[PDB]
Amino acid sequence: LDADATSGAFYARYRDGYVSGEPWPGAGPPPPGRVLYGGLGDSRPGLWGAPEAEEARRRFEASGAPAAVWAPELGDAAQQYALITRLLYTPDAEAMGWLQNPRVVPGDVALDQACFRISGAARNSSSFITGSVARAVPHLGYAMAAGRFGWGLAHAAAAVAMSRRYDRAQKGFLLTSLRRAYAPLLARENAALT
Amino acid sequence: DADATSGAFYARYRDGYVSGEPWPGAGPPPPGRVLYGGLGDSRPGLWGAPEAEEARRRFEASGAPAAVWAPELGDAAQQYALITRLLYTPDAEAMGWLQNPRVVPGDVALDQACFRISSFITGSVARAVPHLGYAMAAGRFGWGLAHAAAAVAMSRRYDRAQKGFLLTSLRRAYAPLLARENAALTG
DNA sequence: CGATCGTCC
DNA sequence: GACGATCGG
Ligand SMILES: [Cl-]
């Protein structure tokens, strides 16, 4: 009955009231001395100078590659978003396998434990809302605060990669689909916000 | 890394696949069977079963997408079209509907009957979304939006406001893709 | 009761 | 592969 949609005409007319580069409603930077963590608007204090944050930041700066376990104390969220987004398009990178099960050193686990420790949350579990399904992907709030819809690819790809319901070949098809969808969006968004 | 920062790298990216062409290793299920599990696997059909007929006339009476879909209810292309359109309808609560849909006793009866005729791999993270193999066999990259959105909706790491931002992000990315692919594969 | 997901085989 | 902790319908 809905020939307007199956023919593509409906999607050809798509538009919204949101502007790229402007903050998503209710989103914004974390308070001073704190970093984004958990749900929308939630935050935890910073761990700059702690032994866990200092060890991980040095490994991150000495490698030039995206960190396996990322935290805002390691550097710019825009830099880790750019690295992961690029990794999703680089040939023979096996990015979906890296997002689900990255090679983790003991320093990455300590950084992850210290990040939840300072948060003051009661219980850590599979149900705890963290704002990122994969620890390598920065908190989604930084994309919401910056109005960077192209940074949603990293989260959408990581959600598919973390799911236990698709096999390797099925995940590869979804990465190809996501690649096609986001490539013109990323090109337009990066050109405008620079 | 100015090529990627300026966006020129992403404007140049091109794959080697063609919309409408079968994905490598993917195809229709064997005659008399329906796609199931991982890539290439399948299970026998239930087209004449009562549970499949009780949920078919329910899905055929209401022009809305089924809450628990199965190939015995109709063509996968129809359910994919309804879910994709629903993901773009303002105030549809599509992400919450994918995660926790209203389920009748007839839906779980059809659910149970599919496991009996047949690992954690199912080929669809949400039961309303048809098996991914149907999109891979049809070369429908636009049918990945339903799976990508459903994966986000099923995740426990984002709250509702965070999922809403990703829905708009997925909307803006897939809208030009869907307009081009739907027009090319339907005329 | 189902799910995700940390954590092993 | 699985087992379990742990939340929402
Ligand atoms: Cl194409």
Q: Which helix (H) or strand (E) holds B76?
A: helix B76-88
Which nucleotides of strand D come closer than 7 angstroms to any CB of the protein?
1-2, 4-9
Q: How far is the CA of B126 from the centre of ligand 1 (A)?
A: 26
CB contact, 8 Å: B10 with chain A? yes
Of B34, B51, B52, which Cα lies nearest the Cα of B43?
A: B34
Q: β-strands B33-35, A43-45: how paired?
A: unpaired
Q: Of the candidates B117, B111, B133, B115, which has an alpha carbon nearest to the alpha carbon of residue B45? A: B117
Rounded Cα–Cα distance for residues B124 and A166 (Å):
7
Count CB atoms within 10 A of the CB of residue B177.
24
CA distance A178 to B174: 8
Helix (H, G, I), strand (E, B) or coil at B112: helix
Q: For residue B79, what are the contacts with CB-CB under 8 A and spacing of at least 6?
A: B65, B66, B69, B73, B128, B129, B130
Cβ-nearest to A7 among B122, B144, B186: B186
Total length of chain B: 187
At position B42, the amino acid (one-letter code) is S
* H-run or E-run covering B133: helix B132-138
CA of A93 to C1' of D2 (A): 29
How far is the alpha carbon of A163 from chain B, nearest alpha carbon, in Å?
7
How far is A152 from B78, CA to CA, in rounded Å?
27
The 3-state DSSP class for residue B108 equals helix
Q: How far is the CA of A13 from the centre of ligand 1 (A)?
A: 20
Residue nearest to nucleotide C3 (CA to C1'): B154
Q: Which of A88, A186, A71, A53 is nearest to A136 (CA)?
A: A71
Contact in structure between B145 and B178 (CB atoms under 8 Å): yes
CB B55 within 8 A of CB B73: yes
Spatial contact of B162 and A131, defined as CB atoms under 8 Å apart = yes
Which residues of A fall within a CB distance of 8 Å from B80? none
Name the residue of chain B whose CA is nearest to A143's CA: B165
Residues with CB under 5 A from ligand 1 (ion): B 18-19
Q: Does B64 touch chain A (CB under 8 A)?
A: no
Q: Is there a contact between B85 and A170 if contact means CB atoms under 8 Å apart?
A: no
Beta B42-44 vs B33-35: how paired, if at all?
Answer: antiparallel
**Residue spans per domain, chain B:** 1-187
- Phi, psi (rounded to 5 degrees) for B124: -155, 120
**What is the residue whose two structure tokens read 């979304």?**
B129
Rounded Cα gap, residues A163 and B79, in angstroms: 22
Which residues touch A79 (CB under 8 Å, ≥6 apart)? none
**What phi and psi, each to the nearest 5 degrees, are found at residue A52?**
-70, -45
Q: HSE on the CB side for B3, CA within 13 Å?
A: 5
The data reach a resolution, in angstroms, of: 2.1
Helix A152-162 and helix B144-154, axial crossing angle in degrees, nearest 10? 80
Determine contact: B145 vs chain A, CB below 8 A: yes
Q: Contacts of strand C, CB cut-off 7 Å?
A: A 109, 126-127, 133, 159, 162-165; B 125, 154-157
Inter-chain touch A16–B177, beta carbons under 8 Å? no
Rounded to the nearest angstrom, the minimum Cα separation between B104 and chain A is 24
DSSP chain A: --HHHHTSHHHHT---S--TTSPPTT--PPPTTEEE-SSTT-EEE--TTSHHHHHHHHHHHHH-SPPSS--GGGS-HHHHHHHHHHHTTSTT--HHHHHHS----HHHHHHHHHHHHHHT-S--STT---S-SSTTSPPHHHHHHHT-GGGHHHHHHHHHHH-SSS-HHHHHHHHHHHHHHHHHHHHHHHHHT-
B142 Cα–ligand 1 center, Å: 11
In the numeric block, the tokens 């919309």 are attached to B19
Which of A 93-112 lie inside 8 A of B, CB atoms?
A: none
Give Cα separations from B27 to A9, A91, B139 (angstroms).
28, 25, 10
Closest CA to A98 of A86, A110, A106, A107: A86
List the determination method: X-ray
DSSP B9-75: HHHH---S--TTSPPTT--PPPTTEEE-SSTT-EEE--TTSHHHHHHHHHHHHSSSPPSS--GGGS-
Contact (Cβ atoms closer than 8 angstroms) between residue B132 and residue A170: yes
